[PDB]
From a paper:
Xanthophyllomyces dendrorhous β-fructofuranosidase (Xd-INV, EC 3.2.1.26) is a highly glycosylated dimeric enzyme that belongs to CAZy family GH32 and hydrolyzes sucrose and various fructooligosaccharides (FOS) and fructans releasing fructose. It also catalyzes the synthesis of short-chain FOS, in which the fructosyl moiety is transferred to the sucrose skeleton. Then, crystals from the inactivated pXd-INV-D80A enzyme were used for soaking experiments into β-D-fructose and the different polyphenols tested, to get the corresponding ternary intermediate complexes.
For catechol, we detected a small peak in the ELSD chromatogram but it was not appreciable in the UV detector, indicating that the transfructosylation (if it occurs) was not significant. In the ternary complexes with catechol and HQ, a molecule of ethylene glycol from the cryoprotectant solution was also found at the active site. With respect to the crystals containing catechol, the OH linked to the Fru O2 is interacting with the ethylenglycol trapped in the crystals, which in turn is linked to the catalytic Glu303 and to Glu334, through a net of water molecules. The other OH of catechol is linked to a water molecule at the same plane that the aromatic ring, increasing the stacking interface to Trp105. In contrast, catechol/EGCG binding position is shifted from subsite +1 therefore tolerating binding of sucrose donor to a higher extent. In contrast, catechol, HQ, and EGCG bind at the inulin-type subsite +2, occupying the same position that the terminal glucose from 1-kestose. As it is observed, HQ and catechol are similarly located in both ternary complexes, while HQ is shifted in the fructose-free HQ-soaked crystals. A possible explanation is that the higher mobility of HQ allows the second step of the mechanism to proceed, while catechol remains fixed at its position blocking a putative productive motion of the acceptor substrate. Furthermore, the structural superimposition of these complexes with the reported complex of pXd-INV-D80A with sucrose can explain the molecular basis of the partial inhibition observed in sucrose hydrolysis by catechol and EGCG, whose hydrolysis rate is 50–65% referred to the control.
Residue numbers in the entry:
A (entry chain A), B (entry chain A): 42 to 665
The structure:
């Protein structure tokens, strides 16, 4: 195994375990110390203002199994410190008959058992488990644990009647899934249900959704309400909150609802961030975020979606969330988005970016799999003075429109997402910042124009505002992780409304994915404007490429160039002419970002292990 | 619920949990503090000379489940002290994917991992488990744990390749069972295999048997040998040690071999006790003790058996234990006998006495189920100068015969069992001892004759020597736990060779078992004698009646009389006449015995719990 990155890669499958640990590894984001990670979980702001982040974790392995909560904390979403206890960085693990098959996703009751932060999580036991299998009741249940030391450790309630698991009865038969309890307070839902509490007897101040579906009949989000305030054992099933059809799609801008939901959450937002009103704020909108499975031919059959909803109260004292419009939270290789409340009326969302090595060819050589996305503030994005001639505006696909009184302008509303400002400030302050001169891409533009200042490594950010003619057929964007022989091209094509990431040349290593990523982006044209603008921001972090457009569209992907000099960046131009000009301004490069794990050495591998021949006998985990 | 024991019992099923805790409870023997217990396990003599005894335990329940090792220690087999740790009196419990379904029986390697006492135990996981079910490989495996604090706690080896479980591959297909590893040293087997170690490469000083069988083709005891001395991960399968046929019986004196073995062990004995020679001691005999299942219509389909064996070395470097003669370790409501070595060339055996409430009618009201037998020294019983006219002598059923040179006398050899002398000494010393006058049972004998001194409670022992004519048709024995209305009759009938316990009047409470117990007893007639003698000893301990005859035959049973005065005892006589006289001598009553758990209060119930609706969903444990 040669690690010479000045020549073509050899047969890297001959390399030992974790020999490629640092080669492609993100440095500026949340990632486990080593091994397998997937979904964020147990997210909460602690009493001291710091953020506790959990994650689905399988240390010393590179496939899923014995799934546990790994955890860490941060005062700024950006620089993190691992917990370190008797199980290393794990804080909850399989240990009881009810959760021995895995401690799945869970969420936080901030004032729970004996006043302590309390997690409600999916406790899994034996049996077929999956949306395409014949799962039975008991295999997935919901259980409680609480922490007396701010997340350093958790104490589970005892196993038994009136204790764990606390939710085990399936609310409907033939479920495709029954997991990922999302606990939340909602003045909105309390106000809506206040006249029906005699029907259900559920009067608690916490609600919980559980994600699943029904075999042959689409996904379901099930709503529960805490039966009594200050008591956490009894949760009353109200009814289905979200019901979608088997592989139903709301359209091209909205992914596909698949057969089963995962990691669903409920929030309420206004233009500033989180909204805690009862319905009285006319600018606030109710949202559900959710993953779907088996409604996609690629991306591990997974869509991370969101929908704006209008709540209706049913006669039996339950809530129907009627979908008003429906979108995509991230168009790339990410899934399992979780959101949580943060001080200052914020709702912050973070997901999991998987690798692009689906045949598991170099996973052992990495010695790890997975990272988080960046942490994102959610809010209601409002665009005023939108021109009615904006193409496709009244499809109202992943947005709503409200006409002005005179019908000559429109107010557009949709889900906004932006990187938390703490991370942007820390990144900028720790980076070498180059402000670049604006450029007109015209007849003289090369296909690729390197920036006047170049990155020094695979840890950087770039931004630019691309101004297009209203009838342009030109394409423009950014090339990143670029040498002569390897590069990744991020294009926007206003005529098709497609943002693409072309990865045919991303790496000389052929075992990594090289399919083109695609997001839809609606450029809302402004009344009186003779152009339309795309604000495009890209974070490059080891192998992660994380793209944001107009504080609305997000696309996370992976590129694994071998060569040490495949770090360059610049502007892309196609079909720009003297008449069809793309103006690029507000150009800036941040080289370096932040070391997100300052206490960790460069190599935190502890080696990899095999579970042995019993892994195949039990049939639960791959075993490596 | 009335607890008035001076009048007839009411409907005792209306009584609360553990309200009958003290009513029928043994006081003078090993028993858990509360709840369910079954098989002894993890038996060893510690470095300080004390005895560590483990047991299959389910606290706060009255049926089997979450099965764990409860433990205690004693300096004299008789007075015990519970361990007390983070899990109360438990010291090993289900905690890993490989043992989450139960920590089954295991045995001790005295100098094991890092020189510490080490247990090899059956670690169970999910799936059908049972001799009549379709069990699969992995459901029962064998795992190691070691203790650094003399049994107060145990540390399991890690889960994985080259660690736990250490034995998982089935040695043959379609096993009925694969459990109860019995680890032992054997100079005998080492000497027999010494010329074959090139064939197998197994040269360790520990052997282990695993108990099971093959579907449709009878029971099997599988022999393993430690691959290398001082190393405890690798155990090499040699071959089947004992092979018996599907529901095969060696005859009337030998029970039935059933379909599957449980709790099998291997030992070597001589007339004094344990034998540690290599084969050179011509007085020593190799024995296997084992439980069988599904070869009996009653007694929970369970026979606790033993066999004398002659070892043959196979060409593949394995051992066939050929059965020479075959007997019964206890004829009553006991099972799961374990034996272990004790200083002074002793092998000590102890089993589990189950209740006689198979429909679980009063188990909750008890608040516990089960006890141990007394601890028994094993040895080779030798009877010299036996008359060849002893009826049925040359059937050689559960004994062997060796003729004298002149053919006029016989030496009989069989398995001897007697209560450990420490217990007999402690019982006698703490009791009020009444030595009773000898009696001739003749034409004037009443059916029942109370002893001149009577017990004061349900904790006593009695012994007597019954001398019969060689052609007697008289019956005699002992009545115990007796008032006018309730009593239990222990009869010997030399003409049929049957020792019986008639329990039709044992209790006014009709839900307890009342079937007649039966053991075969061979009175070996001595050359020149004009009579034959039965030495009969009975221990009465709460509800336990434990009977020993001629240091050979054992019969454990249960009687639950309601009335407070159903404690009396005396002699039974049937068909005694002027011509057919039974002489009774050596009569002695010990009233009181010993408080075996001096630190425990009278009521050690902690209440009972229900596992809740998930117990039925998981399908592993009853849940109560
Ligand atoms: C199969 O069998 C299994 C084994 O038996 C079984 O699992 C066990 O289940 C039981 C029962 O559910 C569990 O017992 C509970 O334990 C809770 C604490 O759990 C944490 O701590 C224990 C013990 O920790 C000590 O020991 C360990 C090991 O040595 C050390 O590491 C620790 O440092 C600590 O050591 C100190 O103490 C020792 C003595 O105990 C000393 O020896 C030592 O020197 C130290 O000083 C840990 O073992 C636990 O770890 C395990 O679990 C975690 C997850 O939780 C895993 O991550 C980990 O790997 C382990 O598996 C864990 O860390 C107790 O809190 C709990 O007791 C409460 O609940 C019951 C009711 O259900 C009450 O009876 C009891 O009174 C307690 O309730 C009171 O207190 C709580 C909290 O304060 C209140 O909320 C509650 O209202 C109540 O308050 C009352 O009192 C107040 C005043 O005090 C009053 O104001 C109130 O009004 C009120 O009256 C219970 O004991 C046990 O942990 C399980 N063990 C394991 C190993 O899993 C399994 O379920 C079985 N399976 C089946 C299918 O049946
Ligand atoms: C799913 O995930 C699960 C969770 O991750 C996973 O289970 C875990 O598996 C791991 C890996 O197998 C287990 O880790 C092992 O733990 C052994 C010790 O186990 C005992 O102690 C721990 C820790 O105890 C501390 O913390 C608890 C909890 O707070 C306290 O109660 C204790 O008092 C104690 O507290 C002190 O220390 C803390 C810090 O650690 C402090 O915070 C605290 O303040 C105190 O000071 C317990 O948690 C264990 O309890 C659990 O298990 C028992 C059964 O064992 C249950 O009954 C119980 O309920 C719990 O479930 C337990 O009591 C370690 O010995 C072991 O490390 C050895 O092995 C590995 C190799 O496999 C080596 O890397 C390592 O070096 C060690 O080997 C050396 O040492 C041994 C023994 O000394 C030697 O034999 C060996 O040769 C070697 O020697 C070397 O060094 C010598 C010099 O030192 C040298 O001379 C030699 O030459 C040689 O080089 C390992 O860490 C972990 O316990 C499991 N945890 C649980 C909760 O189950 C599960 O498997 C996963 N499932 C799947 C399917 O994957
Ligand atoms: C004395 O000890 C016991 C422990 O043994 C303590 O706990 C009780 O344990 C018994 C079992 O011994 C439980 O009985 C079972 O109850 C089931 C129905 O439960 C619901 O109703 C009761 C009655 O009002 C409620 O109290 C329960 O509430 C508790 O549980 C819920 C969770 O569901 C918690 O949220 C609460 O907080 C409580 O903890 C429940 O709401 C019932 O299904 C079950 O029925 C079987 O058994 C009976 C009798 O044999 C049959 O009539 C019936 O047909 C079922 O029989 C089954 O038999 C076989 C084998 O099981 C199966 O193959 C068959 O198909 C069939 O299903 C049973 O009655 C009791 O619920 C439980 N009580 C608790 C936890 O409070 C006592 O508390 C303790 N007493 C004291 C004072 O300490
Ligand atoms: C680098 O990290 C790894 C952890 O990932 C460490 O451990 C190794 O892990 C790999 C898996 O990643 C193990 O590979 C598997 O080995 C099986 C055969 O094992 C036996 O042979 C090897 C080779 O000589 C021995 O080393 C083993 O000894 C160890 O295990 C025994 C217990 O059996 C212990 O007692 C010892 O002490 C050792 O610990 C064994 O004797 C093999 O069956 C398995 O095969 C699958 O995978 C390969 C490749 O994909 C296929 O060719 C094959 O067809 C099988 O594919 C399966 O694929 C799917 C999904 O699994 C199934 O559905 C199919 O039906 C099919 O079965 C695999 O090759 C390796 O054994 C293990 N090594 C150990 C523990 O030593 C490394 O140690 C670590 N390296 C370092 C230097 O630290
Ligand atoms: C019944 O018990 C008696 C008394 O223990 C046994 O007779 C004794 O046997 C020993 C050992 O051979 C002798 O040393 C004693 O002299 C005998 N004592 C007597 C006759 O009082 C007798 O062997 C036992 N019988 C059976 C059939 O087990
Ligand atoms: C980058 O590295 C490759 C391989 O060493 C080399 O061919 C190329 O000229 C280097 N320089 C660039 C792309 O500027
Ligand atoms: C990282 O550390 C692991 C564990 O010690 C080691 O096996 C591996 O070779 C190291 N990799 C690198 C790139 O240093
Ligand atoms: C309430 O009504 C809805 C709509 O029919 C139904 O799906 C839900 O199950 C009901 N809730 C109950 C029965 O608790
Ligand atoms: C909204 O405005 C557009 C453009 O003027 C018009 O076509 C449409 O009918 C208006 N909708 C409503 C509800 O008035
Ligand atoms: C660099 O990043 C750290 C960690 O996030 C942050 O606290 C610090 O303020 C940053 N440095 C600046 C802004 O100069
Ligand atoms: C075309 O673009 C280049 C580079 O921005 C610029 O120098 C030139 O002035 C542009 N042409 C016109 C006509 O503006
Ligand atoms: C024993 O008790 C019962 C019921 O109280 C009584 O009838 C009998 O006379 C008592 N005395 C005996 C059997 O000596
Ligand atoms: C024994 O103690 C248990 C637990 O406190 C109690 O429920 C039961 O009534 C007691 N039984 C007796 C006979 O004292
Ligand atoms: C050794 O031979 C016996 C008799 O055929 C057989 O049952 C056993 O499995 C053999 N041992 C092996 C193959 O290890
Ligand atoms: C043993 O002795 C009996 C009685 O004398 C006789 O019938 C039998 O044949 C003898 N057995 C042998 C092997 O000599
Ligand atoms: C009573 O029993 C205890 C406990 O077994 C024992 O140590 C003691 O010696 C006995 N008392 C005597 C023989 O007087
Ligand atoms: C018959 O038995 C009684 C009681 O033991 C005794 O008094 C009497 O002497 C016996 N008869 C003969 C003839 O020995
Ligand atoms: C003695 O026991 C046997 C069972 O081994 C039985 O067949 C026989 O009928 C019994 N006879 C008497 C008289 O009890
Ligand atoms: O690791 C298991 C967890 O990951 C998910 O499948 C999302 O991909 C969740 O539904 C589950 O809780
Ligand atoms: O409790 C389970 C244990 O009990 C037995 O079944 C004996 O009755 C053993 O074979 C097993 O190890």
């Amino acid at each position: 195994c040669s690690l010479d990155q000045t020549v073509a890669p050899g047969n890297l499958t001959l390399c030992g375990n974790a020999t490629l640990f640092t080669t492609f590894r993100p440095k500026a984001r949340f990632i486990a110390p080593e091994g397998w990670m997937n979904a964020p979980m147990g997210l909460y702001q602690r009493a001291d203002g710091s953020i506790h982040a959990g994650y689905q974790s399988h240390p010393k392995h590179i496939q899923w199994g014995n799934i546990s909560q790994g955890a860490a904390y941060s005062s700024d979403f950006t620089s993190w410190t691992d917990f370190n206890g008797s199980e290393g960085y794990k804080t909850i693990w399989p240990s009881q008959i009810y959760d021995i098959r895995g401690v799945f996703d869970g969420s936080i009751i901030k004032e729970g058992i004996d006043g302590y932060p309390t997690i409600l999580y999916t406790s899994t036991s034996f049996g077929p488990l999956g949306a395409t299998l014949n799962e039975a009741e008991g295999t997935e249940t919901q259980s409680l644990a609480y922490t007396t030391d701010d997340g350093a450790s958790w104490i589970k309630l005892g196993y038994g009647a009136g204790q764990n698991p606390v939710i085990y009865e399936w609310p409907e038969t033939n479920l495709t899934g029954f997991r990922d309890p999302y606990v939340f307070q909602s003045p909105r839902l309390e106000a809506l249900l206040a006249n029906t509490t005699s029907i259900t007897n559920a009067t608690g101040d916490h609600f919980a959704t559980i994600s699943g579906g029904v075999h042959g009949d689409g996904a379901r989000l099930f709503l529960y309400r805490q039966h009594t305030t200050g008591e956490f054992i009894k949760w009353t099933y109200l009814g289905p909150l979200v019901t979608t059809g088997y592989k139903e799609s709301y359209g091209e801008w909205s992914g596909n609802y698949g057969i089963n939901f995962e990691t669903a959450g409920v929030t309420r937002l206004n233009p500033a961030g989180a909204a805690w009103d009862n319905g009285s704020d006319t600018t606030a909108v109710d949202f559900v975020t959710f993953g779907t499975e088996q409604g996609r031919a690629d991306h591990q059959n997974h869509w991370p979606l969101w929908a704006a909803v209008d709540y209706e109260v049913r006669d039996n004292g339950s809530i129907e969330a009627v979908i008003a419009y429906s979108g995509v939270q991230d168009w790339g290789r990410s899934y399992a988005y979780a959101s949580f409340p943060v001080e200052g009326y914020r709702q912050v969302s973070v997901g999991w970016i998987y690798e692009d090595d689906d045949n598991v060819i170099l996973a052992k050589q990495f010695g790890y799999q997975g990272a988080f996305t960046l942490f994102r503030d959610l809010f209601v994005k409002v665009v005023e003075n939108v021109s009615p001639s904006t193409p496709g505006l009244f499809e109202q696909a992943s947005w709503s429109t409200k006409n002005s009184t005179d019908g000559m302008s429109v107010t557009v509303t949709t889900l906004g997402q932006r990187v938390v400002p703490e991370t942007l400030a820390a990144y900028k302050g720790n980076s070498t910042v180059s402000t670049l001169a604006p450029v007109m891409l015209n007849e003289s533009a090369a296909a690729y124009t390197p920036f006047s200042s170049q990155p020094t490594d695979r840890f950087y950010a770039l931004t630019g505002s691309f101004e297009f003619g209203l009838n342009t057929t030109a394409k423009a964007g950014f090339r990143v992780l670029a040498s002569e022989e390897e590069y990744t091209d991020i294009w926007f094509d206003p005529a098709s409304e497609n943002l693409t990431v072309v990865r045919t040349a991303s790496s000389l290593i052929k075992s990594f994915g090289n399919d083109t990523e695609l997001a839809k982006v609606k450029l809302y044209e402004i009344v009186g404007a003779e152009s339309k603008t795309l604000n495009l921001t890209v974070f490059v972090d080891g192998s992660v490429i994380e793209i944001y457009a107009n504080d609305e569209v997000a696309l996370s992907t992976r590129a694994y160039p071998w060569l040490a000099n495949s770090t360059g960046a610049g502007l892309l131009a196609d079909g720009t002419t003297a008449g069809d000009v793309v103006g690029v301004s507000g150009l800036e490069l941040w080289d370096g970002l932040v070391d997100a794990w300052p206490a960790r050495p460069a190599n935190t591998s502890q080696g990899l292990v095999w579970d042995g021949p019993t892994a195949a006998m039990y049939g639960l985990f791959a075993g490596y």
